[PDB]
Design a protein around this ligand. Structure first.
Ligand SMILES: [Cl-]
Ligand SMILES: [Cl-]
Ligand SMILES: [Cl-]
Ligand code: NA
Ligand code: NA
Ligand code: NA
Ligand code: NA
Ligand code: NA
Ligand code: NA
Length: 333
């Protein structure tokens, strides 16, 4: 001591800087980070990292059967470039890289499982073992089912677009490695629905939900890690002090380090042995509970759409790079 709020928090929670690009990963050195379409779009703007994009195109060209089409090339490249960038992240960070599974497959268990397997085998081909990877999947019924299958073969999953207790419990019962609820998106939905201008501290509906999920998971002895993410304000983070992980904007990290005073570990549950109900949500109950939760079903649907938009934009960028690559060869001696 004296102990900053950040130092207190770090004694209770694995704190990870929220990063969306490689420069920020290098700067902040987060324990965990993510390869996804948006990070790669960001990198395309960088004269260093864009070369790694062109390399994925070249590698995909080498990989495919003779006579491949441009469509087949772009598809294969989307896979390879995601892995190239994940390997680049693993050279910087000490922990795990979340690897986004194409969100367009979010309602297809078999396709999600097959894509995860493909990405894991690509990582293996490039010298990276599966324990360094989290396969990141939207928490639809089908995505959780795919993760259930994957976990059984030792492929660790991060279940994201996770908004309610129903989704959390379904993941826990399926032995999912990690869930990443987006707290600030839950807050946003309630403000947007009601015109309430704020939900302060413990009243924040995202904080309420993640608090409940954490308490249940620990009391029941579930192994699934809870990573609170996507924060709108610093009070949300403080309310969830003691969560397994919290992904936090660099500016909030700096502010917590500046602050003094007392931070209470609110998320402090441990295993209990008692007669409380063990909740289960089989497919029908899951679907009905989701239907009744307008917040979770809309934020899940919008999130999937947003992920799908960014992967479509990636595909468009790869088409551009291919064109540029061809032009450069034709005009060079
Ligand atoms: Cl669903
Ligand atoms: Cl506002
Ligand atoms: Cl050339
Ligand atoms: Na191939
Ligand atoms: Na992909
Ligand atoms: Na696809
Ligand atoms: Na408080
Ligand atoms: Na913790
Ligand atoms: Na995306």
């Amino acid at each position: 001591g004296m102990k900053s709020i950040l130092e207190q928090l770090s004694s209770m929670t694995v704190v990870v800087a929220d990063t969306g690009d490689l420069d920020s990963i290098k700067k902040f050195q987060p324990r965990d980070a993510t390869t996804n379409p948006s990070l790669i779009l960001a990198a395309a703007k960088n004269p260093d990292y864009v070369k790694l994009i062109d390399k994925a195109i070249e590698s995909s060209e080498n990989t495919l059967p003779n006579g491949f089409s441009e469509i087949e090339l772009i598809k294969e490249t989307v896979d390879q470039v995601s892995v190239f960038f994940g390997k680049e992240i693993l050279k910087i960070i000490s922990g795990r890289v979340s690897t986004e599974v194409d969100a367009r497959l979010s309602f297809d268990t078999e396709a999600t499982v097959k894509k995860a397997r493909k990405l894991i085998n690509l990582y293996k081909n490039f010298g990276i073992e599966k324990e360094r990877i989290l396969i990141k999947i939207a928490a639809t019924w089908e995505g959780i089912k795919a993760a259930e299958i994957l976990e059984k073969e030792g492929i660790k999953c991060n279940l994201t677009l996770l908004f309610n207790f129903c989704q959390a419990v379904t993941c826990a019962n399926a032995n999912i490695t990690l869930i990443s609820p987006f707290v600030g998106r839950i807050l946003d939905w309630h403000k947007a629905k009601t015109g309430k201008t704020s939900f302060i501290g413990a009243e924040d509906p995202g904080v309420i939900s993640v608090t409940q999920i954490y308490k249940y998971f620990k009391e029941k002895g579930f192994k699934t890690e809870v990573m609170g993410a996507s924060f709108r304000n610093l009070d949300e983070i403080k309310e969830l002090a003691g969560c397994d992980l919290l992904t936090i904007a660099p500016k909030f990290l700096e502010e917590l380090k500046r602050e003094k005073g007392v931070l209470i570990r609110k998320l402090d549950a441990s295993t209990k042995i008692n007669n409380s109900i063990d909740y289960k949500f089989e497919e029908k109950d899951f679907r009905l509970s989701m239907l009744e939760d307008q917040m979770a079903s809309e934020k899940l649907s919008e999130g999937i759409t947003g992920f799908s938009k960014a992967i479509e934009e990636l595909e468009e960028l790869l088409i551009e790079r291919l064109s540029e690559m061809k032009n450069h060869k034709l005009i060079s001696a």
